[PDB]
Amino acid sequence: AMSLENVAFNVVNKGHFDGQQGEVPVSIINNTVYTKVDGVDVELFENKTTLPVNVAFELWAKRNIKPVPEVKILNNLGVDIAANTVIWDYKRDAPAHISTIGVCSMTDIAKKPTETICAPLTVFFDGRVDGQVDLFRNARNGVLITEGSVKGLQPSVGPKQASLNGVTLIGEAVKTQFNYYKKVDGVVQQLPETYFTQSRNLQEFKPRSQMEIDFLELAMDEFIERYKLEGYAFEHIVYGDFSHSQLGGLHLLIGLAKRFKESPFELEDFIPMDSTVKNYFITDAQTGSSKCVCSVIDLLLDDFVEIIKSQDLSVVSKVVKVTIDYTEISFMLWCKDGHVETFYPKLQ
Amino acid sequence: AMSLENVAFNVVNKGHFDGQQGEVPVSIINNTVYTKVDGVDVELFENKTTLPVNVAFELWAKRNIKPVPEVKILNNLGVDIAANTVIWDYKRDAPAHISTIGVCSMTDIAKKPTETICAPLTVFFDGRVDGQVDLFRNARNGVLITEGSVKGLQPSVGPKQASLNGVTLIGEAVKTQFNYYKKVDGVVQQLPETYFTQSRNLQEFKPRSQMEIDFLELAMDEFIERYKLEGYAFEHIVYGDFSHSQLGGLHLLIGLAKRFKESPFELEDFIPMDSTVKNYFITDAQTGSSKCVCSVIDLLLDDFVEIIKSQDLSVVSKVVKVTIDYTEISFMLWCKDGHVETFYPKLQ
Amino acid sequence: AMSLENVAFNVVNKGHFDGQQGEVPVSIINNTVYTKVDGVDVELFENKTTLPVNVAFELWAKRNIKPVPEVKILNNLGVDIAANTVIWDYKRDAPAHISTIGVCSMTDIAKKPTETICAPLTVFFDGRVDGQVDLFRNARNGVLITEGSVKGLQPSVGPKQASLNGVTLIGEAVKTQFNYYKKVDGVVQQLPETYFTQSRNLQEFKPRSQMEIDFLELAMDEFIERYKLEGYAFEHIVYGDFSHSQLGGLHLLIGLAKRFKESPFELEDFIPMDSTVKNYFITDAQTGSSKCVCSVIDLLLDDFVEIIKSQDLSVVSKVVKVTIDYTEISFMLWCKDGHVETFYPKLQ
Amino acid sequence: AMSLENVAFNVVNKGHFDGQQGEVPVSIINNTVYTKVDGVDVELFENKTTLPVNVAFELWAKRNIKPVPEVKILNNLGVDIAANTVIWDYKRDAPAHISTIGVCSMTDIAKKPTETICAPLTVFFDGRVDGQVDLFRNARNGVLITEGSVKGLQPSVGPKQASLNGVTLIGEAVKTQFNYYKKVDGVVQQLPETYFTQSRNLQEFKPRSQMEIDFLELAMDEFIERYKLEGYAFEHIVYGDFSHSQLGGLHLLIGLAKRFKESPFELEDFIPMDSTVKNYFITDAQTGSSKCVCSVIDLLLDDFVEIIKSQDLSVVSKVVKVTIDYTEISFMLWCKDGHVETFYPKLQ
Amino acid sequence: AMSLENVAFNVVNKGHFDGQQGEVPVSIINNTVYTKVDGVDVELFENKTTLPVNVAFELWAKRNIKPVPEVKILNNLGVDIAANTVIWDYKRDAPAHISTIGVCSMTDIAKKPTETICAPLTVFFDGRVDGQVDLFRNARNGVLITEGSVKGLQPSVGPKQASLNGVTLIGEAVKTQFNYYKKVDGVVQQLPETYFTQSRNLQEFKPRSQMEIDFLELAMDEFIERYKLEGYAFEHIVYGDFSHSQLGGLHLLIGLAKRFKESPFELEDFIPMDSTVKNYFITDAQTGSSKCVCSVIDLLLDDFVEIIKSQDLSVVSKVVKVTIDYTEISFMLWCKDGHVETFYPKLQ
Numbered sequence A, B, C, D, E: 001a002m003s004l005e006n007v008a009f010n011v012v013n014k015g016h017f018d019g020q021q022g023e024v025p026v027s028i029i030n031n032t033v034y035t036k037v038d039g040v041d042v043e044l045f046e047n048k049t050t051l052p053v054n055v056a057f058e059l060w061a062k063r064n065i066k067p068v069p070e071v072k073i074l075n076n077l078g079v080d081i082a083a084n085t086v087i088w089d090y091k092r093d094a095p096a097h098i099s100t101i102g103v104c105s106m107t108d109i110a111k112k113p114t115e116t117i118c119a120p121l122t123v124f125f126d127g128r129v130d131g132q133v134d135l136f137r138n139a140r141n142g143v144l145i146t147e148g149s150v151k152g153l154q155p156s157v158g159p160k161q162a163s164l165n166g167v168t169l170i171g172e173a174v175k176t177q178f179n180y181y182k183k184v185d186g187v188v189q190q191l192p193e194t195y196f197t198q199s200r201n202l203q204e205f206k207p208r209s210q211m212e213i214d215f216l217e218l219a220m221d222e223f224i225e226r227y228k229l230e231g232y233a234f235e236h237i238v239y240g241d242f243s244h245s246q247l248g249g250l251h252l253l254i255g256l257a258k259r260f261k262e263s264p265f266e267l268e269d270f271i272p273m274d275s276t277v278k279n280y281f282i283t284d285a286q287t288g289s290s291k292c293v294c295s296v297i298d299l300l301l302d303d304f305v306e307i308i309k310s311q312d313l314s315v316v317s318k319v320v321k322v323t324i325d326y327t328e329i330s331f332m333l334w335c336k337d338g339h340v341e342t343f344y345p346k347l348q
Ligand SMILES: COCC(=O)Nc1ccccc1
Pocket: B133, B134, B136, B137, B138, B150, B151, B152, B153, B183, B186, B187, B188
């Protein structure tokens, strides 16, 4: 017995839709959902989606409040829809997927993932919910996350971090590292050997290794000496060249974080969404060095060192494909006389 | 257990809110309420009010679908709120009154008219509903309509016509003439001797008397002779003078209707609302004669003849107050040498 | 001392902005201007313009309520702005010109037409207003309309009809035929010999000549015989061919009107604006004959007969330029063996 | 002589409505109020209210710019309307009260608080304004704030802090501690003995006592030892248990502030308004411990210690009512074997 | 071949409009521009302008991404339009100028600055673009910026800082100091000797001189002693008097920055735009001292000391005009007994 006023009552009394009975008075003005609290209207939700306000409100209220995979992982694994939940995209303030299965009467394409309409879609299944591993086994397409082993099914250990209510974190009081499974046309697919992005913020960047601790602490010349990175263009790629009108390199988040402590810079996120490789219009505030499209990836510095040191340096131009977050990321490797000139997450 | 989807279900299945159980999927985009009917969205309501869309939708759904007094009568009698109903103002596409009593959780000031907040307001009571005549008895301020005699109370016979779903009509299969009662600070009032406006349309004008039948049939010179209206400026007041750049007179609807059969004209209703006297920006298309503010009243021609023939014609300028629709309408009477020059419902 | 509430007061009490002092309470929700009349909000104006609501409200209130040239004439004569008035475009529900001169603080480019900013613009001047004929004299570029003779200047007799509050009419109680004058870079121009469109409606079409009276009364074969129009393709051009999937001809409004009395049809006005030649997506309901772009002009049938009979019929395809409403309208004349096949106002 | 352009002129030239004469050009597009400053439009106000844009703009301009009681105190004391001022709710970006008395023509229910419509409403009176203490004496219902003593009337010393233009502060150059008075049905009401919340921010939290200074400085085990709080569940209630998937306790703002310095956490304020007890959807960023509804109160730690130490610890479950900010706040006290298990501001 | 989808493609792939060929799917809902990225809609632009969404989107995409003069300098120099570029006003999130020259089909008044419509407008020319110095020479009105000398034309050395993508900076990898030229009615105008504002933020304030370094480091009494500023009211003007209900002085940004480190304060920017003198509604959080209109200028403290020390101190009240950012800023100088009482950027 779903209603706007019942969804609103749940938001007001439980913090989210908890299936409790009751109604509060609601008013909808434009794209904002308000409720009457002691004579005056209080804003409950601002529609930042392309869906009708009341519809978005319901999906936001019915959002999954358990640690879930980050939208980039779900996209990289080809997920189209979720089974009886709403994965909320906090980077976009909108549902991660267009339609729902057993969530909202307006967005539902089916009540159960077993309906023939879900067969061609990659449905996301959560093994922590009862009967969802069995629904994955019966699905034609899908992705499954589990906390433990599923007999017979070969696991793929996912990232240490997961998104809990928009807060990406490595769980201590909750499990955030999941086993991942994928199915394409009824056939379980072997998920590749992958690297994971660290999902760190530029503002609250924290090193997750001795190499990362030495990068932020030591000077450029002593770090490149200690970790024997001579001839790998770390000065351009990781550190960034701010001497010309076009900002050179700066494609690793740890390098952006090191610079950020010395001087600020504008990072214009012109495509705001969760992505393995993020593109930014960077403008350095100190020098005035800028780049319209600066591809930035957040790999662990040890993983990025391993990737670049595992390359053949004898070709002038070469595309280097690296599996990161289950997706193949093409990099552009430019060499000269057996040394790296540039290495960057390939644009276009 | 009121909800947006339950109100919508009632509209879809019963034509209005009939208190039936059930929900249909709803989407609200801007000021329009839509429902999903077989995969596609169908518009159910367009908010033309100053209230939130969903709130106005509920009040529109909960509108009184029985013949009710016209909003002008209700306003003229000082009605502030209705008892457990919504009088819908079809001339304004909005509720006739700001707040409700036992209708909508958002607009309700009380659930029952007996709550102390309704004591100072003039609450409209419908005697056709059970216990409302007794609620009028207990109420300090209010207006009561009844179909029949009310023991003790002295009636005021209201107009022959009432508004049934926006259609103003003189009932044949329903009762539309009501007995009116009014109470101010606990005292039953003696409602004044009043004339009633006929609430006719310019397009579908129909004569309600032999004088009105003779006005539309005979020529100006013959009618003024037959009804001995010489010296009463009927040529200017009722018939209208279209010989100069400012349209002369034309203040009675029957005169506008006689004109309309021959020549069409633009009537710009710049204050769209139900009023005893209506103001129009008229532009005659045949001649180009025009008036920015042309006050138009729809009295029965016999009643207008009686009003004008009961005036002293010895003063150049005089305000003539006439009780019409329980309100005092001031008219401006201009004379010269014992004859009328003009007589019109006083503007501003 | 211009204000939103003062403009609103003028609309409520005078029908338009009449420079009277006073304020009424106003509320603006979206694109609608409302006022509080006895506790409830009444809609005063709906913004159908690309200007801010309150700005368009003021310009609409300050609209010229005297018979003015039709927007098509003003456009055809290169008018950019009006002198201390607002020509309201009722076909577009928006001001005919972007900026104003001494009307609204938001849209004003100058307070007086003598300011250097108005020198390059073609300013419209109304000779009926005091000093405007002298303002035309001092103005470098402009169009002047007068009711009578202007000493020195040679007149151009304009159309019989003018627009009074959106009602296009040939005045009887007002002057609608104006003398036209034009100045380009300080030089008074000799306005060309022109035909005028009649500005008639399809619904209320009235014949303005014996030929037009005979067109609507007689049958196709009798009319073409009486007026010796054999070989001029009047059957296709004026009468219209409804025998194939593409509606043949039908470019003269009198022919559309003759049809309209017998069979109705859809005229989709896909470019809603005042134009000498109007384009329509016509769908005949009786036959199903249709044309995506059907150019329709409303010339007097005697004038259209004169135009077509004054053409050389020896070329297969030829562009025929005809001055109508002071603008050059290109027509497409198609002949075969010394007779007209088609003649139509050239599209795109 | 109130107008949109006059309100706008005052905002532009005085920072707020200061009753100065003059008009600036205004444009209203959607919910934003703009003014023309040197050819371009500058945004003056963004309507975040449920009122019409121009109406909200006027109330925002006419906001009380003197230190006023915080909206929570005004709500807790039953205030419905203010006398000839607008208390602006900065937590909601909207007027604290629906209607006004002598402020805006659109929202006014009366010009003076002595009108019979204000009799049943609790009107807020400011003793610092001339004649307002006399208006409180004559009012039927109301709340009065004064800077000094009012002869005969028994005072209630309010909080040290007040809101000056949205900045909650304890005045140094202004008086912020007021004497409070209340009237219900003509009878002055004795305001209860109350505790006051400190109105501190989580970001800029500053200790206001030696106990608070010792809480933020000392470790959990030495603070609980120094202040003899053994057996009072301060570890769970104040400090917070972040070891399980549901965040334990954490109901005092000082405890949230202590945690905040070690690691961040998301506090989702799902009901954004000024309240004595605030509810939050807290997600700990370090551990991943979370609570959908975490009631948080900001009492001085000495006051919270006094409240919990004044309780009978012999019952398993008990409701403990504590007067805070003139309102009765129910707490839930859970004990076992003569010791506290939990104590929290009771939800539902 | 300009289009909405082509502009969107450029934003998505290049970070801004780079004239590249291609289209992405776009959806416009209200004032937001979205694109479909892998099945879901991602927001690309939020219209904060008074222009149509798609129009503003194009101008934002076509914004000048090279260091440009700050909007205040451009306004102070009378700039009306830019030549074949869009100066984006980041303080207003809107184009700095209403119309364009060769940028957008909707906003263009001309394709080239040589069209007669641009003659009366002060067109901004960028000497770094080919042929723009020649277009300035041929223009009637305009402002020209150049990186080097233009033969014959006498330069005006502009500010050290320029705005690169909204980041105001003193270039290191780019040139930000430009030579300035102005033309009024075909005649080059001598730009006056001027001071420049420093364009610093209150949050990230950095001293640009030994005097500024000593102001922020030394106490009020030792700074005024070291720089011999006794009798110049620096305690009131620069330092600010927070002892009374009206905040005294505080008109220099360095003084606001010194205070900001000790305690916070609300600066309500009620006219959000780039201005030489900025007006703020300041509320001191510590004391509760406030000022509705507090004019704040950001001069180098050495320049402000030079201005105040170059004044005659023998008059009670005097207007002191100082050329800053090419505009004349009137200050109000109040003296008594040969000493300054106050000196502030004159309001009204
Ligand atoms: C004290 O007010 C009088 C009244 O309401 N009398 C009445 C009302 C309803 C029916 C009969 C009598």
